[PDB]
């Protein structure tokens, strides 16, 4: 994506009803800090999800260690809060060649103060004045009270610790809802007239697969015989009517 917002108004995208391309995530390998939870990153290729929350923002190259489920520091204190029990992956890389511009980048912002720690996954766009001391400023700025937000200072004159990271966070769950977003798997070349173990679409058995002229209705999957055996199946990748003997 071409434009991530800051952490005071981070973008959140509910994603479901599609398939996961988890391969090139690991094959990317241009990513600085790439960690995961729940169960191992190699294991998560197939172990799939009801409803994922993909929310992303841009933070500094020093504060990214604050982004960890159950830590402190400003981004996890007042800006964006990972929960106490978390599943997803933190994906983090540098975008110094895009974000930090000569003449100064000050598009980006963050919240520096709030009268409590931040509830998990809840943004804070309320840019009203907080009153640290007791003297009421009441919307306008003044004494004992500061402005809530502040920018970052990004230029390519910054050191490597001050480079902008485009942290995207993937968060996962599991419910009475089905695994609506789920990773695909590779196929096996069809064998005709060979005793061959098989799986089609999760249907499993062992038989001799042949070409067959029995004619399905389109929505259908299996055929069956009188005996409630699985007699004939249709190849999902190339539609064809395959007997099972």
């Amino acid at each position: 994506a071409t434009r991530f917002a800051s952490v005071y108004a981070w973008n959140r995208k509910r994603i479901s009803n599609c398939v996961a391309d988890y391969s090139v995530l690991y094959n990317s390998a241009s990513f600085s800090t790439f960690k995961c939870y729940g169960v191992s990153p190699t294991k998560l290729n197939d172990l799939c999800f009801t409803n994922v929350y993909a929310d992303s923002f841009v933070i500094r190259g020093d504060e990214v260690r604050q982004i960890a489920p159950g830590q402190t520091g400003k981004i996890a204190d007042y800006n964006y809060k990972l929960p106490d029990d978390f599943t997803g992956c933190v994906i983090a890389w540098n975008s110094n060649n895009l974000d930090s511009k000569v003449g100064g980048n000050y598009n980006y912002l963050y919240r520096l103060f709030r009268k409590s720690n931040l509830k998990p996954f809840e943004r804070d766009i309320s840019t009203e004045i907080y009153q640290a001391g007791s003297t009421p400023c009441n919307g306008v700025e003044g004494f004992n009270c500061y402005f809530p937000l502040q920018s970052y200072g990004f230029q390519p004159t910054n050191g490597v610790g001050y480079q902008p990271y485009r942290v995207v966070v993937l968060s996962f769950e599991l419910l009475h809802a089905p695994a609506t977003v789920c990773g695909p798997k590779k196929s096996t070349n069809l064998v005709k007239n060979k005793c061959v173990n098989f799986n089609f679409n999760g249907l499993t058995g062992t038989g001799v697969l042949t070409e067959s002229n029995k004619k399905f209705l389109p929505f259908q999957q299996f055929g069956r015989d009188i005996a409630d055996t699985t007699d004939a199946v249709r190849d999902p990748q190339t539609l064809e009517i395959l007997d099972i003997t």
Epitope: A29, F31, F34, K35
Partner: antibody
Framework: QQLVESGGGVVQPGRSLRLSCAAS????????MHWVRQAPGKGLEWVAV????????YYADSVKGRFTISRDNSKNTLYLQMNSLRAEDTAVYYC????????????WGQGTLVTVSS | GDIQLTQSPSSLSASVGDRVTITCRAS??????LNWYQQKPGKAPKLLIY???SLQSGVPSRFSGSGSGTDFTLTISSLQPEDFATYYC?????????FGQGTKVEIK
């Protein structure tokens, strides 16, 4: 628990000097062991491994002098012979171990000076 | 080729009660295989963090590690008068292992 080293000293270049380092408290045998180098004012530079649990020897190609490494497992001791010397290797050596996400066994010897000079 | 390390800064003269972030950057994407050491000059390197995110016996949480991939972080917090020494990061990803050049935290 504890690592002891063979004696360091001043050796002329091109020569050889076997390095002995004996363990105590727990055996060498079940683990690997390493050697590292510290020149004065210089960072800690890894030298070579030993791997007793099969048998394999890896050397740094940065200092690739065929500094040979093998065992005396029954004495919990390890031998790396200083071969093909050159003066910039004049430093202190350490017997080492790396916590490879599983163990916490990083135990370090006392440090002895190898000197390469005429 | 070899795996390059990048330890930054290579020194930082510090004061009492600080929170110093000694960064060890990597040339490749290393999973978590990075460590940290205490060395007063002439001592044995006392291990501080293993797998870049886990504390060690005898060493309280005034030290605190995090990071993965290329980016690794030494999170020294509430800087103590004994913590001023020469420190080191560490790969164990491939062979050869290299160590960082060291970061001497010292009294201002």
């Amino acid at each position: 628990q504890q690592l002891v080293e063979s004696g360091g000293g001043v050796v002329q270049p091109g020569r050889s000097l076997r390095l002995s380092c004996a363990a105590s408290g727990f055996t060498f045998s079940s683990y690997a062991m390493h050697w590292v180098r510290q020149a004065p004012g210089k960072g800690l530079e890894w030298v070579a491994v030993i791997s007793y649990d099969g048998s394999n020897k890896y050397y740094a190609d940065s200092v690739k002098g065929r500094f040979t490494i093998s065992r005396d497992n029954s004495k919990n001791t390890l031998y790396l012979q200083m071969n093909s010397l050159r003066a910039e290797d004049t430093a202190v050596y350490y017997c080492a171990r790396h916590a490879t996400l599983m163990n916490n066994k990083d135990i370090w010897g006392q440090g002895t000076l190898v000197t390469v000079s005429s | 080729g070899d795996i390059q390390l990048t330890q930054s800064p290579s020194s930082l003269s510090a004061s009492v009660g600080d929170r110093v972030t000694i960064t060890c950057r990597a040339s490749q994407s290393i999973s978590s295989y990075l460590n940290w050491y205490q060395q007063k000059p002439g001592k044995a390197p006392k291990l501080l963090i293993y797998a870049a995110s886990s504390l060690q016996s005898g060493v309280p949480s005034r030290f605190s590690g995090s990071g993965s991939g290329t980016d690794f972080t030494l999170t020294i917090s509430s800087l103590q008068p004994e913590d001023f020494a020469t420190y080191y990061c560490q790969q164990s990803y491939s062979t050869p292992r290299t160590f960082g050049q060291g970061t001497k935290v010292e009294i201002k």
